[PDB]
Amino acid sequence: LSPAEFFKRNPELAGFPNPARALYQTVRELIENSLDATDVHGILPNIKITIDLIDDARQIYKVNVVDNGIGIPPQEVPNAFGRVLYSSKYVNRQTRGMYGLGVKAAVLYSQMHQDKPIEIETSPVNSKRIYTFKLKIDINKNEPIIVERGSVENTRGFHGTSVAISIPGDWPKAKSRIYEYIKRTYIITPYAEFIFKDPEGNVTYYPRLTNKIPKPPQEVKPHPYGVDREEIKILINNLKRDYTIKEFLVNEFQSIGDTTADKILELAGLKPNKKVKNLTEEEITRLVETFKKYEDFRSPSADSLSVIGEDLIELGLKKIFNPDFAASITRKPKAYQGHPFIVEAGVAFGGSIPVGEEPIVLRYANKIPLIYDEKSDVIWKVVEELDWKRYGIESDQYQMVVMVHLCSTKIPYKSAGKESIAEVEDIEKEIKNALMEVARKLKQYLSEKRKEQEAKKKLLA
Ligand SMILES: C[C@@H]1C[C@H]2O[C@@H]2/C=C\C=C\C(=O)Cc2c(Cl)c(O)cc(O)c2C(=O)O1
Ligand SMILES: [Mg+2]
DSSP, X not given: OOHHHHHHHOGGGTTOSSHHHHHHHHHHHHHHHHHHTTGGGTOOOEEEEEEEEEETTTTEEEEEEEEOSOOOOGGGHHHHHHOOOSSOOOOOSOOSOSOTTTHHHHHHHHHHHOOOOXXXXXXXXXXXXXXXEEEEEETTTTEEEEEEEEEEEOOTTOOEEEEEEEEEOOHHHHHHHHHHHHHHHHHHOTTOEEEEEOTTOOEEEEOOXXXXXXXXXXXXXXXXXXXXXXXXXXXXXXXXXXXXXXXXXXXXXXXXXXXXHHHHHHHHTOOTTSBGGGOOHHHXXXXXXHHHHOOOOOOOOGGGOOOOOHHHHHHHHHHHHOOSEEEEEEOOOEEETTEEEEEEEEEEESTTSOOBSSOEEEEEETTXXXXXXXXXXXXXXXXXXXXXGGGTOOSSOBOEEEEEEEEESSOOBSSTTOOOBOOOHHHHHHHHHHHHHHHHHHXXXXXXXXXXXXXXXXXXX
C-alpha cells in the first residue's frame, strides 16, 4: 500500500481518527508549515488563523491560515498539496510535524469527505504577482486536479501563502485543545504574532514579544549510521554524476574524509574506483554492515537542529504564566541511531500559576507542542519520577510549570497516531539530566527565598 492508500484505510493512525481530531490536526499542519515558512528563513512569523462553520448540519468547517513566509513557487504548488510521495524522504534538516503526509493528509481528508476544492494564494519573495489556485487531490490517482489557476498583481514587499481547506470537523469537541495548541506554540514562539478567529466569532490576539529569532537549522548530509539499504539506493539513484564508490562515500555523507573512506572501502571489500551506479546488492549489504559496525565516525552534526534557546524559553514562560521565578537549560547535543538530538528544559514557579498537586507539564518536539497522550510520554514519566522535595518543594501543593523540548532529525514516537515520545534510554537519560539541571536552579531560588523570609521574620521589627 502507498502512504496515501494506507492513510485512507487507517486515518486514525495519522491523526485523523474522527472529525474533532481532523479539525485540530488540520489547524496544526497549517500553523506548522507557516512557521517553517517564516522563522526558518529569518522572517518574524505573522500568522492569521480563522475557522468558520460552513455547513451546520453536516459540520463542515473551512480552516484558513495566512502567513508572511517565503511563499511557494507556482510550479510546485500542484504537487505540494495533491501528490503523496511513495516514501518519506530521509530527514536532513529539523522540521516541524509528526506526520509524513503533512498538509496532504488534510487535503485527502477534505477530498474524501466533502466537495469544495482547497484554495491557495502564494507570493514568493520578490514576486510581481500573487498566484491563486483552487485545487483537489485525485483520491484515486494520487495526483493534483487544478480546478482554477490564475494570478494578480502583487503589492510592495508582499510575500507569503494563504491556504484554506474545507473538512468535516467538530468544534465543540476540539475547541479546548485547539486553543491549548495555539497557547503552547506561543509560549515557545514569543517572536511570532498570531490572530485566531474561531467559529463562534471569538478573536484572540497573541502579540509579538521580541524580535529575536533562533538560529535556523541547516541541511546536512546523512550520517552513515542512519542509513539502511533502501536509503543508500535512493542516494545512488539521485546522483547527478558518475561518482566512484570512494567519491560517493566522501561527498554524500557526514563524517567520511579521505582516510575514513579508504578504511570503510577496505572493511567493506569494495573497489575505491568502481562506479557507484554499478554497486550490486551484495555490495550495498556489506557497506551497510560496515557502517553499522564502524566505531570511528564523529557524532551526527547538530547543524541540522534548531533550539528555542534559554532566553526565549524564559521570556515565554514569564510572559504567559507571570511566575515568581523561571529558569531553563539548553543542553549540549547528543546523538542516537545516526541522528543528533538536543534537550531543553524549563521551569516556572509561583506567581499567577494555579495551585495543584502536580506540575503543569509542557512537551515539545521540534518546536511543536505535543497535546494528546501525555501520560504515556517519556517526558511525563521523567517528571513524575523526579522527587521535588529534593529540590526545595516542601508542600504537597505548589504552583509549577515544567517544560521539556526534544529536537532531533528523528524523533522516536511510541505509536503512529499518538503524540507520545518513546522511552528510548539515551533520550530519557538526557531529559532527566536536563530536568535535574533546571530543578537545581529552582532549589537555589527556593532556598534563597526561604532564608530571606526567615531573616525578615527574625531580624526586622
Ligand atoms: C515552500 C514554502 C516554505 C516551506 O517552509 C514551508 C514548509 C512546508 C510547506 C509545505 C507546503 O506545501 C507549502 C506551504 C503550506 Cl502547505 C502552508 O500551509 C503554508 C506555507 O507558508 C507554505 C509555503 O510557503 O511553503
Ligand atoms: Mg510539518
